[PDB]
Design a protein around this ligand. Structure first.
Ligand SMILES: Cc1cc2nc3c(=O)[nH]c(=O)nc-3n(C[C@H](O)[C@H](O)[C@H](O)COP(=O)(O)O)c2cc1C
Ligand SMILES: Cc1cc2nc3c(=O)[nH]c(=O)nc-3n(C[C@H](O)[C@H](O)[C@H](O)COP(=O)(O)O)c2cc1C
Ligand SMILES: Cc1cc2nc3c(=O)[nH]c(=O)nc-3n(C[C@H](O)[C@H](O)[C@H](O)COP(=O)(O)O)c2cc1C
Ligand SMILES: Cc1cc2nc3c(=O)[nH]c(=O)nc-3n(C[C@H](O)[C@H](O)[C@H](O)COP(=O)(O)O)c2cc1C
Lengths: 333, 333, 333, 333
């Protein structure tokens, strides 16, 4: 594979169409899904030349640990839909690549099994029925060694995914929510989580500048600027279009991650030049999982690592921090 | 039906082509018809997160009455073209959904029959030959229980609909202007109407900021910012592109509605975030009528209600007023 | 015919392909030819409502004479290429419609014969070999009753029309430059013409703001803001994109006309709302001539008159002067 | 041939597909390759009229010598891939046209043989393993009569050309790096070159404004504003989009050239109107070489000379300096 699009083609061949659609689709007319890509394609980097590249490193420190790239695997529910080893295959590859892996509340393998793989697991929280059950899930994740709580804040309920409606998509009997034997989150829920863990709390799904500021004021250690891959509000702005304004407003008060449509190392460089600390990558990781299991995810992460190193050096950046100081110019496609 | 476009497909199958063209077409090159959609597709919403959604309501108060959604059925002439029950089918469904229905001067069932269905009828006025006949039509509507006079102000004469010209389109003998057994309106006509009814007068077809201000000064209770679905001046700006500037200029002096290309609950949310009090929806209501009569219109209104509730909650809005305080960002499509 | 595009289709059927290409083509990659249309399609009018339209007139006064529309027939060389009656057919139709007709230096019928048709003839000058011959041509036109000298200023030499090169296009033996039995113009040439006629001198092919100002200072009675239909510099800005800035800079010191891609009455309204006094129309007049001779040109001018009246009234304009006070908004297509 | 695109079509017919791909391709998704063309297509020139064109000259003085056009042949490695005479054919045609030819470090004929053709040779440097070998290459070029050192500064390593990867492209055994029997450059490398030659040093591949300023401060005699034809960082801004800002920042302190997508004399005029001193042209020269050897390159240069003269005169420019004072306006395509 020489690009992430090679993996997309491989996954479309292997997966049943309704499962490919569950993975690929967005809500409504898919305007926000397409806009995530349009927005990245409009950004051009202004590279710097002639800088010392003798020790080019793609590593970052985030939430108390080194990561090999400014990237983590995004939370994607129900990974056994894509390959029989599901989350364990992805987590193993992420561990071996030095990339954090986000364990989902709706994982198809229990969070303790995935955490036992090792690596740098984070845990994604969907707020449950009552505060007590939600905090017990956070405590399970912390006891299992997860390093951050990624509280998803853009799902008071799930969006209207018309491909899934039209296909009548349902989970096969062999895929379950393995952490179980939901109610809309509010700022009060965030405070309950913050008060009941020492782990950094990361709010995923922030798009408004004032919500990013409030996240810092609320004690978040990070945010993910995101429209949920275009799967929640159809017509929500792409995270990449709010990133620069959000980075300026928080002015270093928390880590600012972004997701949505990251499909190459050059896209990682664009996100960092707009001020992101790191990106999440969702669908491409599942393409690699579907195409070739653990080895497929390994190959994807090796390719992304090469593309990130390549883009950084071509742009004159010996570190991710230097990449954040690059300027950009919007173009037309 | 899971989107309004499903209804469009259904109506194209059933209607004779020349009737589909009378419904779908615009004037001239159809530049303004297409621009109504382009303009909405360029608007992206910046949703808010983590707000209390325990009592999410789509209701508004307008012109003295509660409506279940920030939406009314736009005036569309000659509804028996689309289904034998015509206006009565649409009015019944609107009444049952809690949505105001606009009775047309050129309705194919008399305004008194449609008003007898109940619900919240408004009456749309085209200015007649003389002031006396025009005021007698207003008085008929008021006596029949209509709640607002929607005075259409963008039709000094009808635009040049080339599809209708090319098709030689004419009304079948079985469709008539049932209120009868026109001259261009001016500001003097507006004053004559205002002086002769206690009902709110709503000027439909305002695009210039100074005409919106003059409408308030003239005693209008509302305006509809509209290019008449691209059927009048070809090259007229979309209403959605003037809405924000008009809302600022009137600064609460009247209700500001918008129409043209509203095709989902997400489009309703965009219109409200740009400052509209409510929208009108025209062609989709006739698609539903053609496809399945009263039950089709009911299904359309149920779908729109679900989409509006969904979009509002995903955007963190427990009320329409909160949706009007959302910010937007223009993108590229 | 219900649009000017109906005439284009008719002319393509009848004309030999190489003659259609001589008419339709531009220079180079045809970037400026296409941009003339793109630019008009981006302009949207903000119409006014509720104004008195009881005496809607499309007439203007220009260069000392009333014209029935804010339009003249652009200079197009060698009209016998398109129909055997050539310029006489076009001039007769223009006279009967009350539209000025521009007689070309490179007309295929002598300027005195075309002027004898009557109407409001203008004369277009290409600067000749020496001042004396050029002034003798101006004097012929004045003696024959031409009312204005349209000095074309964007042709120091002819542009590179690749369709004509590829086709090896040449004039048939039966088409000649009937005024004959060229050198680049300069500001000195303009002064020589101005000093040797009392007729208004109109500089056709101005795009830079400072050249429009210099034209006023040089004693021009008008300018035509134009890129020569995309036939001269490939990459020259469309006239319609410079019009507003030029109208502001001359601030009434001369008439400001525009051409390039005017294809409907709505396009005339756009040009006037951007500040033009009048437009020229070139290719569509030749489509009508090719399709149906004099009667075809008559039908084109009747259609344009109807479209201009329609667009003006729909926009609330009882006169061309009111149309010049309309505002516009740029959109995306 | 009447346009450069005629030569592209000719070269595609003759070259093996993998060699055409090595020539045509870019890195990654080819976003920067396409953007070089998009960016030029968005620029429109505002031509001036009525100026004296009696002595229109396309000549410039650059790096101490007259050139017949504001253009040089860009460095393109391994020209024997395209025709058996390779660099000698191109250099002969450039010499006869009065155009500088850039000899590559990776030329497939030795730099001394190409320099012996005569003309105005420049020499392009890729920084080698150690300073000593790199300076010996500069000294060879200077001893052979090269007039400028074009130090390429955007290749710390080569970009990821996916067409070449997919094709498994490799040099045929009959094509070698004839100057031989690389390490990333830095500002220190530039100073080493500057201190060891009296020739002007030209930094090729500058895009950031501060790197252009630093180039002047470092003693460069010129820069080439360039993204390396979209072959280095995928997502790098087109040089043409940075040119105006760079020309303002250096404020005459060095020559500012541009490359990337120049495909006509009109594109040369656009580059000069944006402030370039001259352009480089790469791929089209190789299309001409592939199509017809030396005579093909001669024909390309004659066509470009005609197109540059044509565009300059149509724009009212009797010299390249006048063309640099033209204004431009961005449009939409
Ligand atoms: C099939 C699928 C399942 C997802 N599941 C979750 C989830 O359980 N929790 C969450 O916060 N986001 C979830 N997401 C959103 C992703 O974390 C991510 O925000 C989004 O896919 C955008 O990144 P991408 O364009 O790289 O896929 C899911 C996305 C997909 C496509
Ligand atoms: C077939 C048809 C008939 C219409 N009849 C009327 C009318 O009688 N009075 C009126 O004010 N507008 C009339 N309109 C305009 C609509 O009220 C509305 O402004 C327009 O269709 C834009 O909304 P849409 O895109 O949702 O259709 C008509 C529109 C259509 C398509
Ligand atoms: C076939 C042809 C011949 C033309 N001949 C002349 C001419 O003799 N003198 C002149 O000033 N412009 C000439 N023009 C330019 C037109 O006057 C006009 O500027 C241009 O065609 C743009 O208008 P349009 O888009 O309506 O065709 C010619 C244009 C065409 C297409
Ligand atoms: C096949 C090929 C080989 C090239 N070799 C070199 C090189 O050896 N040195 C260099 O500085 N640039 C090299 N370039 C970049 C060109 O000099 C030039 O910057 C680029 O092709 C953009 O110009 P164009 O669009 O006119 O091709 C090469 C480009 C191509 C296509």
């Amino acid at each position: 594979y020489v690009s992430l699009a090679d993996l997309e083609r491989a996954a479309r061949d292997v997966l049943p169409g309704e499962i490919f659609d569950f993975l690929a689709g967005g809500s409504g007319t898919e305007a926000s899904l397409v806009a995530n890509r349009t927005a990245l394609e409009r950004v051009f980097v202004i590279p710097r030349m002639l800088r010392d590249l003798t020790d080019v490193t793609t590593e970052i420190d985030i939430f108390g640990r080194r990561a090999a790239l400014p990237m983590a695997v995004a939370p994607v529910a129900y990974q056994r839909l894509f390959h029989p080893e599901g989350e364990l295959a992805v987590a193993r590859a992420a561990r071996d690549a030095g990339v954090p892996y986000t364990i989902c509340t709706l994982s198809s393998v229990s969070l303790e099994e995935i955490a036992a793989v090792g690596g740098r697991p984070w845990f994604q929280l969907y707020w449950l029925r009552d505060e007590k059950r939600s905090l017990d899930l956070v405590r399970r994740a912390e006891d299992a060694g997860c390093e951050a709580i990624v509280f998803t804040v853009d799902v008071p309920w799930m969006g209207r995914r018309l491909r899934d409606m039209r296909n009548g998509f349902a989970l096969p009997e062999w895929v379950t929510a393995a952490n179980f034997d939901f109610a809309p989150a509010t700022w009060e829920s965030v405070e309950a989580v913050r008060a009941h863990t020492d782990l950094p709390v990361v709010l995923k799904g922030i798009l408004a500048v004032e919500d990013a500021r409030r996240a810092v004021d609320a004690g978040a250690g990070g945010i993910v600027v995101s429209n949920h891959g275009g799967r929640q509000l159809d017509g929500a702005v792409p995270g990449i279009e709010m990133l620069g304004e959000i980075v300026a407003a928080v002015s270093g008060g928390c880590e600012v991650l972004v997701d949505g449509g990251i499909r190459s190392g050059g896209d990682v460089l664009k996100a960092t030049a707009l001020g992101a600390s790191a990106v999440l990558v969702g669908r491409p990781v599942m393409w690699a999982l579907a195409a070739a299991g653990q080895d497929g995810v390994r190959q994807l992460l090796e390719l992304l690592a090469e593309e990130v190193r390549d883009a950084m050096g071509l742009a004159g950046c010996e570190s991710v921090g230097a990449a954040r100081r690059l300027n950009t110019k919007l173009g037309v496609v």
